Ligand binder design. Structure first.
Ligand SMILES: CC(C)c1cc(Br)c(NC(=O)Nc2cccnc2)c(Br)c1
Ligand SMILES: CC(C)c1cc(Br)c(NC(=O)Nc2cccnc2)c(Br)c1
Ligand SMILES: CC(C)c1cc(Br)c(NC(=O)Nc2cccnc2)c(Br)c1
Ligand SMILES: *[C@@H]1O[C@H](CO)[C@@H](O)[C@H](O)[C@H]1NC(C)=O
Ligand SMILES: *[C@@H]1O[C@H](CO)[C@@H](O)[C@H](O)[C@H]1NC(C)=O
Ligand SMILES: *[C@@H]1O[C@H](CO)[C@@H](O)[C@H](O)[C@H]1NC(C)=O
Ligand SMILES: *[C@@H]1O[C@H](CO)[C@@H](O)[C@H](O)[C@H]1NC(C)=O
Ligand SMILES: *[C@@H]1O[C@H](CO)[C@@H](O)[C@H](O)[C@H]1NC(C)=O
Ligand SMILES: *[C@@H]1O[C@H](CO)[C@@H](O)[C@H](O)[C@H]1NC(C)=O
Ligand SMILES: *[C@@H]1O[C@H](CO)[C@@H](O)[C@H](O)[C@H]1NC(C)=O
Ligand SMILES: *[C@@H]1O[C@H](CO)[C@@H](O)[C@H](O)[C@H]1NC(C)=O
Ligand SMILES: *[C@@H]1O[C@H](CO)[C@@H](O)[C@H](O)[C@H]1NC(C)=O
Lengths: 316, 316, 317
């Protein structure tokens, strides 16, 4: 008798009708980066430069490192050295054979890539992207000091509940100059990228050399029987990409994009950037419960049946 | 006896095995806007101009107002007036100090922004974006008359159910020239942005002056025991961003993007646009139920146990 | 019925399971090269930076297959396309300032001769207009049939504190370097082929790519945590998501328009408008996991005993 109400009715939440969450997320990134490499000279980077695409709210990408190829035009051209594409004679290379290496469609003739070696001749954007390891340290290290503001609006449809992650006790003056600290400022929604990466027990620079995927998990576990002010979100940070170099393929997170230009004579030129960066995904989940009568009665009946069973067992 | 079957078996849906929904959404926007401001002259806007990014199906952004800065180049330059960045002497400004205001990295020297005042000297894209309130009325007011077509395809995996929001009774001739009216055309999926904003008890112009977030909620609550034709979606519209100027930070919804150009001599120029617009999010949710035997028997047993309990109570 | 309860309700109904949903992240990378040799454009190659718009939309990627290109478009006063609803009989026929829903532009009072035979209302917009021309057949990027896509899915069950990846630990990197997905031969390879994905839905790639369409990759994570961890594997299914009946749907296929902007020496702005038809792949991850519990088991046992009492009473009568 005491056991049923003690555990099944209370801790198991059998007296609760439950619902899931419907959420929307808005992210705004602020920060400025500087680069002083010899190849590019002296350059600054603002919010319109290191975020690709410009608006991907809910999952934003921050550029940290890049490889740039300029003055690329559609032309016949030479492949990079490779044992599987080395040219012994004109009959070695096959015309029209599309390769999976990403160079381009092959032609019958082959040309000398350098004095020492010759390779098959293909038509593509040239000059090709050199196979070079990304620079270390990363070009946009100062991305460690960027800030991100996250605004989350949740709704429980069955209970007709709407909530925001910005508590009503918080004034705008404090939000103007604010930062998230686990011990000092738990209600600030303005996180730091370096802090987010550190909370997962990782170093920002090593991750940003080759990129990676990070995930911000917001948990809305709210009991609507309790007062509304007890409904608060819980923030957790977790890496989402494999680090073992033996099991995964294509470590880190990188992708290629391009800029197109037209010259005076009308010819088209392309600048190809392969960017390595850290992609942050906002993952919102939760479940809410409210008191109900029918589930309570069914659980009480099942508990009484279990009491009858245990009484019968003890009788024997 | 009558109570159990009357309420617990029927209204509580205890005889139902339930499943969630798996949905895909496709949105297409049509409309044309005109602008006749003195700064830009006389310009037209089509679907390829006021949607950024071009394809974000499921959550589309419609530009309504903008601030444009042109001929921005990487150079040493002067900051905007600010009490926290006012220059008293060369020793006042600190070289290499990165600011959170978004201007750029500071240098030791400082220069006169105007005759009256002088500020610290920084290197960034210049000329800077002037701190100017967005124009009122909004530049793209005609965005009130745009139309959006929403196609939603849902599936319940456990029951192997597939459904579309376009009913089979609807012919293409009616869909060619169609609009959504709550009282007249409830099955048309072609909504009007002005109507969507009005259904939330708001004015379109005021919202579009500074932007905001809107949310279209589609509810698929379908009982598969009933015939298939009874499975229809329900559309609701709700604002998702705070309007109180005292609690939220960064009111409205705006973001910055850029266009890059290359001159004949090779120098790079940027045109920075800060755009204010209304972001519509499509939020699809639902739950379906079908008859089952085991849950029915368990509920009948629990009801009989409750009947035994109430009989015992009445005996005492 | 004592046997029946344990045989069916306790075991097959999974009444002894506390259940949780899945929280997933998806990463997609596309590799392939296309060639076009049309007379209008000449001889062009296409890489991963050309046929994917936008460049990063991980979880739902769009692959360009066919396109219509209009060049040298500038803001100017100009003439409309022929149309019975926009044909000009006289200057009083066209109304100035009347915005149309056809997508041409705002109308002006005057009207001009589109050709010698016919005249139409005069509007200000980007010109020359996009000609109303059927998309080329066969599609320009047919070689998109041979592209490959790598899908990496990371799932978590929060209540049970479970984290899993779709790349099994038994798989080595050497096999993943040169790998392809075959239902009968290589079920654990996550490197799919677009042609194979379309074929698994009983469709032809070329016909779909002529006008575009929407495809959906469904990954099912139905894992029983009571069983060992190695039994937790995903199941891949492929389904078309857009209607094919030309009588019920509107705007068949999947296409959208985008633009490129250029600035000339004198400062005037020019636009190149591309209407692209392509196949959009959506990754849809769903699942549910269960683990043993005591309270649900006891409640189900009690309900089964109550049902046993009911059936005994019924048999007595
Ligand atoms: C020329 C080179 C040094 C260079 C310049 C810039 Br600016 C950027 N950054 C961007 O283009 N960001 C961006 C924004 C919006 C859409 N697409 C991309 C890069 Br990666 C390389
Ligand atoms: C020069 C100024 C008057 C101007 C011109 C245009 Br055109 C636009 N619109 C866009 O660039 N839209 C858009 C589309 C695709 C990708 N990125 C942006 C803007 Br906001 C300002
Ligand atoms: C000039 C014409 C032949 C042409 C050239 C190209 Br290159 C492309 N392709 C793209 O522009 N892809 C793309 C990538 C990133 C952002 N926006 C678009 C197209 Br459709 C037409
Ligand atoms: C950038 O580097 C150059 C030489 O490498 C140096 O003269 C200059 O002071 C540097 N600027 C900054 C801001 O570090
Ligand atoms: C980030 O800011 C701190 C404090 O100003 C500074 O010490 C650190 O060097 C900055 N990070 C980088 C990469 O410069
Ligand atoms: C704003 O909120 C902070 C948070 O503690 C508080 O210290 C401060 O007094 C508040 N300001 C006003 C004017 O109430
Ligand atoms: C735009 O404004 C100019 C002057 O401000 C005027 O002459 C012209 O008729 C206007 N055009 C439209 C379409 O309103
Ligand atoms: C939208 O259309 C209506 C009817 O044609 C018109 O009265 C209204 O002015 C239009 N909106 C704007 C912003 O011009
Ligand atoms: C098309 O559907 C509309 C909707 O009511 C109907 O009025 C009309 O008769 C239908 N047309 C045909 C040809 O059936
Ligand atoms: C492209 O077409 C031209 C003529 O139409 C032909 O000369 C050339 O060989 C073709 N190239 C390829 C790679 O098919
Ligand atoms: C795809 O590859 C196969 C095998 O190499 C080839 O037969 C086929 O023609 C290719 N597809 C296209 C569209 O060329
Ligand atoms: C890599 O995995 C494949 C998969 O069967 C296997 O055949 C091969 O022997 C493995 N290589 C090594 C070095 O274990």
């Amino acid at each position: 008798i005491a056991y049923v109400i003690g555990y099944v009715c209370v801790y198991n939440k059998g007296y609760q009708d439950t619902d899931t969450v419907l959420s929307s997320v808005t992210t705004k990134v602020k920060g400025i980066a500087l680069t002083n490499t010899s190849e590019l000279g002296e350059r600054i980077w603002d919010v319109a430069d290191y975020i690709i695409p410009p608006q991907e709210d809910g999952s934003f990408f921050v550029l940290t490192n890049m490889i740039i190829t300029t003055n690329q035009t559609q032309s016949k051209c030479a492949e990079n050295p490779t044992p599987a594409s080395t040219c012994t004679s004109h009959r070695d290379c096959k015309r029209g054979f599309n390769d999976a290496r990403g160079d381009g469609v092959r032609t019958g003739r082959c040309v000398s890539y350098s004095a020492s070696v010759k390779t098959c001749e293909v038509l593509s954007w040239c000059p090709l992207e050199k196979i070079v390891d990304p620079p270390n340290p990363p070009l946009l290290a100062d991305a460690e000091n960027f800030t991100v503001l996250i605004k989350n609006n949740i709704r429980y449809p069955k209970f007709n509940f709407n909530k925001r992650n910005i508590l009503p006790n918080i004034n705008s003056s404090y939000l103007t100059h604010c930062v998230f600290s686990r011990k000092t400022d738990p209600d600030c929604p303005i996180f730091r990228l370096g802090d987010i990466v550190g909370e997962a027990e990782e170093d920002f620079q090593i991750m940003a050399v080759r990129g990676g995927v990070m995930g911000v998990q917001i948990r809305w576990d709210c009991d609507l029987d309790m007062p509304q002010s007890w409904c608060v979100p819980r923030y957790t940070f977790r890496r989402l990409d494999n680090k073992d170099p033996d099991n995964n393929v294509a470590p880190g997170y990188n992708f290629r994009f391009a800029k197109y230009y037209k010259n005076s004579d009308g010819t088209e030129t392309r600048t190809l950037i392969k960017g390595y960066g850290i992609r942050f995904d906002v993952m919102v989940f939760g479940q809410a419960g409210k008191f109900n009568i029918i589930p309570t009665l069914l659980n009480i009946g099942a508990g009484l049946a279990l009491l009858g069973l245990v009484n019968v067992i003890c009788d024997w």
